[PDB]
Amino acid sequence: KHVEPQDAISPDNYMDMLGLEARDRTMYELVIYRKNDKDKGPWKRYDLNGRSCYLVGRELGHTEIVVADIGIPEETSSKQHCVIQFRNVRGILKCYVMDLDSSNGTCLNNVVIPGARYIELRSGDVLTLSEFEEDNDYELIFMNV
Numbered sequence: 001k002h003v004e005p006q007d008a009i010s011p012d013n014y015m016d017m018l019g020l021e022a023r024d025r026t027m028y029e030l031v032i033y034r035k036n037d038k039d040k041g042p043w044k045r046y047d048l049n050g051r052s053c054y055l056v057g058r059e060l061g062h063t064e065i066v067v068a069d070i071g072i073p074e075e076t077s078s079k080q081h082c083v084i085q086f087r088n089v090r091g092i093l094k095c096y097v098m099d100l101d102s103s104n105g106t107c108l109n110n111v112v113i114p115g116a117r118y119i120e121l122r123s124g125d126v127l128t129l130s131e132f133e134e135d136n137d138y139e140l141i142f143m144n145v
């Protein structure tokens with residue numbers, strides 16, 4: 001199971017220490033598009049401000065055991081697929097993705113990332129939960145706002 005770094009911090013706690021009103025702080029979201037009807041707009045938005053880490057993985061609703069905090073209906077995604085991890089990096093809040101040695105891989109902006117390695121996320125970045133785009137019905141967009 002995933003063990004958080006010593007400098008893990010939630011965006012809420014970080015931004016609160018800095019004494020920031022809504023308009024003066026950065027907030028974080030995972031925007032989920034269901035590809036087949038993305039013209040209708042985002043299917044869901046997951047708030048990423050309250051925890052220092054979020055486990056992404058399979059949750060179909062098709063009995064199913066769910067471990068992930070962010071459950072995506074991807075048939076070929078793993079139950080524990082990847083983690084979104086916030087870190088207070090020498091005083092600067094940064095966010096990383098790490099693939100948890102998933103079966104099919106995690107793609108960041110169409111690049112399969114190396115397994116078990118934090119890779120920095122930037123606003124607008126697109127995650128998909130397989131190295132095979134053909135198999136992905138969803139795309140997950142990391143947003144800073």
Ligand SMILES: [Cl-]
Pocket residue numbers: 114
């Ligand atoms: Cl590599």
Ligand SMILES: [Mg+2]
Pocket residue numbers: 068069070071
């Ligand atoms: Mg959930």
